[PDB]
Design a binder for these strands. Structure first.
Lengths: 258, 243, 475
DNA sequence: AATAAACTAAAAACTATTATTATG
DNA sequence: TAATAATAGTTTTTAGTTTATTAG
């Protein structure tokens, strides 16, 4: 009666026991005129699903209809009108509805004509499984280019994406066993690790920002490998790394020399 | 027709076998044709249903029915499409044998099913034939019967079965009879009869019964020529219904 | 048969079984018993009543006594009511709407149980009560024991095990009463029947007959027939169906039904009456032909399951006496009775062998081979089948000895009831799952897959060693 | 063009059930 | 005039309809 758009169209609320009792779902479709059925029939537009029982899984196993969470119904209940389906209140695709999530959505909840907000992005990203199957060089090459091509290399806490520093935590350089204990020299590496910085503990081609900590007499050892590698590293104070991310920035070598 | 399959004695060690329907309660070859009263052909003859809804004259069609089951106080809906996955899945036309026991434990009383199978080997498989012959000779020597989980085909039903061999000078094979499921074991308590003080047969009745038994022997007694001959052989007489 | 066994479940609520907690598997066992009953027999009744709570839901309004399910046929709604309290959250919500341990009196709960038993309006064959508590609680004890004795005198049975485990805590209930592990759904899809087959007359001769009680004992089981419920309303249709006139239009009549078999040149048109009268040969009963030795049997001519034959001292008195005499003679005689048997009118006769069934009472006096006879069908000539000749090769003593060593290593006692039908079991489980709105319950093979697939190495397989053919016989 | 899992009528009993002819 | 008679509808079997592999 009220939302008579649901009327003249049959809906199968067969499980419908996630949190809403069936009679309430059966009642609400009545003041909206929608037709209720207790079996999957071809005249049913979609199946209003609830808990995940064996037979609704069989309905999911079958391709007879569309498996719908009550959230879409509640969205339809509150709006008193049909709501286009999204991969957040919808379960299973029928061949007619298979293209529906392919027409205005690509492969996830992301759409092609509805701008995504933070809530949409979080739901879309949550739908995507979490797995970092990518080597750290590739974050520096392609993923760092996301902050480059789209100009995000100035982000406060992640700006060492393309800056590769020296984890200056050794009394003698070129030796990785004389780790300095009791000091906060490891903060530079973690701050480098806070971004896409390739944390190379030894003087290598990657080392370009020597962050001198509590010992500056080690510059002589830096001179040995300052010529053996192309991108020469420069003597930089703790402000370039230790205080830069504390200030949430990325300092420059010239202003942080020594 | 033959049942060409493999006898799975053990995990592997399968043996090619062929089985035939041996003894069966025969049915009529041709069923009666219900023909028209005057045309005497199939013009107004048809099998059909209306499926009228129990109401006021509303009816239903084939797609409108649901194969429910009486779950006690109520009926739970169910469909053949649900049966497709909610059913036991068989593994081809297997002949899996699982157990071995002594012939004493089994009983001619506990012979079930509706057919008999002469468990022969496959066609001209001499190795399989001699292996089956050795196995059946061993079983006969030890009276050591076998338990068979039988399935006619992929769509058939699992069938526990007893296996014991038959040996003659013209045919030698194994006899298979369907064993029961524990649901089939119906029990009915009965009062004892040999201790019936109210109905105790008199010794005169006993001797009269003995004389009757001796007089109405329907088989020739085994003489020095072992003349254990059936004077009234029933097995050689066809069903009088067909004649 | 009228009358059934009545079992009621009583469980204490004294915040002692709340701590797995005894209440938990008590509820689980009650649910399993209810499921086994609804799958086994519907004529029985179940009742669920609790005591010790803070609520007094009962007919006479006695303290701490709560009734949940009264004596009625098992139902899915009762199962859901039980299941809503099965979980730990179910346990706490149960304790919320019901109430925790409080004061009570066993006299009151026994009185309520007696009232509930009297509430039924049917002849009820047996009356049993199941009670659950961890330890015996007990004035109150004297009146409780007196009332329990009175109820036991009225024809009420009691059952209980303490929920601590051993044989330690039954002190206050030593005399009150006249193990639940087997009740934990160990039996499933049971079938119960009480009737008997059609009693007939044993036409042993031309003048005197014996009222014989026919009894089936191993008849084939099958799934219950489906119902043609509607798609939406989920209720069956009237199922109206009979042939009418279609080519000419109109309604056909039973008198219009003509039967024929097109044979050779012409179709011999007849009516049904000739068809039923063709099936008629004699009157129902067992026309005895004589005796034939049991050794004179083909030992492989089973065609229809055997039926037990018992005396029925209701139409002639000579049944019991003559059957006892024959069974006594069945000791000395191994000859078997030959009878022409017809279950009812218009049935072709079958030759029948009456194998001596003499009672074998065990230590518990189990009626093994009940005293009487079993019907043994004898195949006709047409029932036999041809068999292509096969006398190719014999076996060797080495091969038969090796096979003996292989086979007798693995022996089984062959418990008769050790196997059930996997199809029926799975069907019952699927119906159970659908009736309770759950997932796939479980799959349990009834030994259909041989266990030898894993213990063949345990029995020392030697046929693999003995490949008689250079080419693999098991290709 | 055969056999057989898998439906579909159909025919006894074990239960309640009612008309006798009990009398003017 | 104040009993037992034939008597329904139970389940329970039991016999008669339907789709996979041989023949061309």
């Amino acid at each position: 009666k009220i939302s008579n758009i649901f009327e003249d169209v049959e809906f199968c609320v067969m499980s419908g026991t996630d949190s809403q009792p069936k009679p309430d779902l059966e009642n609400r479709i009545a003041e909206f005129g929608g037709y209720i059925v207790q079996n999957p029939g071809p005249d049913t537009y979609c199946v209003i699903a609830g808990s995940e029982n064996i037979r609704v899984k069989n309905i999911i196993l079958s391709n007879k209809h569309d498996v719908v969470k009550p959230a879409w119904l509640l969205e339809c209940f509150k709006t008193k009108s049909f709501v286009p389906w999204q991969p957040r209140f919808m379960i299973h695709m029928c061949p007619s509805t298979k293209e529906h999530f392919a027409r205005e959505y690509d492969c996830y909840g992301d759409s092609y004509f509805i701008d995504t907000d933070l809530n949409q992005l979080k739901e879309v990203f949550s739908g995507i499984k979490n797995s970092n199957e990518q080597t750290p060089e590739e974050m520096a090459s392609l993923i760092a280019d996301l902050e480059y091509r789209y100009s995000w290399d100035c982000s406060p806490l992640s700006m060492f994406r393309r800056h590769t520093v020296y984890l200056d935590s050794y009394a003698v350089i070129n030796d990785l066993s004389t780790k300095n204990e009791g000091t906060r020299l490891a903060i530079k590496a973690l701050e480098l690790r806070f971004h896409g910085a390739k944390v190379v503990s030894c003087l290598a081609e990657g080392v370009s920002h020597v962050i001198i900590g509590e010992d500056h007499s080690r510059v002589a050892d830096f001179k040995a490998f300052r010529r053996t590698f192309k991108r020469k590293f420069k003597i930089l104070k703790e402000s370039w790394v230790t205080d830069s991310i504390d200030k949430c920035e990325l300092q420059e070598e010239n202003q942080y020399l020594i | 027709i033959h049942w060409p399959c493999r006898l799975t004695i053990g995990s592997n060690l399968s043996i090619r076998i062929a089985a035939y329907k041996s003894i069966l309660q025969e049915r009529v070859k041709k069923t009666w044709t219900v023909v028209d009263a005057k045309t005497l052909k199939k013009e107004d003859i048809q099998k059909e249903t209306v499926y009228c809804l129990n109401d006021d004259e509303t009816e239903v069609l084939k797609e409108d029915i649901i194969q429910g089951f009486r779950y006690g106080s109520d009926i739970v809906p169910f469909s053949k499409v649900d049966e497709e996955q909610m059913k036991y899945k068989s593994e081809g036309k297997c002949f899996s044998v699982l157990g071995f026991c002594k012939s004493s434990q089994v009983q001619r009383r506990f012979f079930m099913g509706n057919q008999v199978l002469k468990v022969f080997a496959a066609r001209d498989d001499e190795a399989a034939a001699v292996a089956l012959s050795s196995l059946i000779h061993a079983l006969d020597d030890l009276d050591m019967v076998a338990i068979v989980r039988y399935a006619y085909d992929k769509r058939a039903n699992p069938q526990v079965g007893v296996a014991f061999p038959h040996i003659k000078h013209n045919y030698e094979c194994l006899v298979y009879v369907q064993l029961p499921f524990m649901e089939d074991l119906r029990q009915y308590m009965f009062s004892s009869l040999k201790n019936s003080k109210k109905y105790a047969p008199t010794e005169a009745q006993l001797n009269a019964v003995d004389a009757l038994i001796d007089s109405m022997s329907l088989a020739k007694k085994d003489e020095k020529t072992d003349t254990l001959e059936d004077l009234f052989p029933t097995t050689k007489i066809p069903n009088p219904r067909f004649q | 048969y009228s009358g059934r066994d009545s079992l009621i479940f009583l469980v204490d609520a004294s915040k002692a079984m709340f701590e797995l907690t005894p209440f938990d598997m008590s509820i689980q066992c009650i649910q399993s018993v209810y499921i086994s009953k609804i799958i086994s027999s519907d004529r029985d009744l179940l009742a669920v009543v609790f005591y010790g709570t803070e609520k007094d839901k009962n007919s006479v309004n006695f303290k701490n006594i709560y009734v949940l399910q009264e004596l009625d046929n098992p139902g899915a709604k009762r199962i859901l009511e039980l299941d809503q309290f099965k979980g730990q959250q179910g346990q706490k919500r149960f304790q919320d709407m019901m109430g925790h341990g409080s004061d009570y009196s066993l006299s009151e709960v026994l009185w309520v149980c007696a009232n509930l038993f009297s509430d039924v309006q049917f002849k009820m064959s047996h009356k049993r009560i199941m009670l659950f508590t961890n330890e015996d609680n007990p004035a109150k004890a004297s009146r409780a024991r007196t009332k329990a004795g009175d109820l036991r005198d009225t024809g009420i049975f009691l059952d209980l095990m303490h929920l601590k485990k051993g044989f330690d805590i039954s002190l206050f209930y030593r005399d009150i009463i006249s193990k639940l592990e087997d009740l934990l759904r160990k039996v499933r899809a049971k079938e119960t029947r009480k009737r008997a087959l059609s009693r007939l007359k044993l036409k042993l001769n031309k003048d005197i007959v014996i009222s014989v009680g026919i009894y089936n004992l191993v008849q084939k089981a099958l799934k219950p027939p489906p119902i043609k419920l509607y798609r939406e309303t989920n209720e069956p249709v009237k199922t109206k169906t009979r042939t009418f006139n279609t080519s000419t239009g109109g309604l056909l009549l039973p008198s219009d039904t003509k039967r024929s078999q097109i044979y050779g040149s012409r179709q011999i048109i007849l009516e049904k009456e000739e068809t039923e009268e063709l099936k008629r040969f004699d009157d129902p009963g067992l026309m005895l032909m004589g005796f034939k030795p049991l050794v004179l049997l083909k030992k492989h001519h089973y065609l229809r399951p055997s039926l037990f034959v018992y005396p029925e001292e209701s139409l002639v008195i000579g049944s019991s006496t003559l059957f006892s005499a024959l069974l006594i003679k069945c000791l000395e005689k191994e000859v078997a009775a030959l009878c022409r048997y017809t279950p009812r009118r218009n049935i072709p006769p079958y030759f029948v062998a009456l194998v001596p069934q003499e009672e074998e009472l065990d230590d518990q006096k189990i009626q093994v081979t009940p005293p009487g006879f079993q019907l043994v069908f004898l195949p006709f000539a047409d029932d036999k089948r041809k068999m292509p000749f096969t006398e190719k090769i014999m076996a060797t003593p080495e091969q038969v000895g090796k096979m003996k060593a292989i086979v007798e290593k693995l022996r089984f006692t062959y418990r008769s009831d050790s196997f059930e039908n996997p199809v029926l079991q799975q069907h019952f489980r699927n119906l159970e799952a659908l009736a309770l709105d759950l997932m796939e319950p479980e799959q349990a093979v009834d030994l259909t897959l041989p266990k030898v697939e894993a213990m063949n190495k345990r029995l020392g397989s030697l046929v693999d060693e003995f490949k008689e053919l250079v080419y693999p016989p098991d290709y």
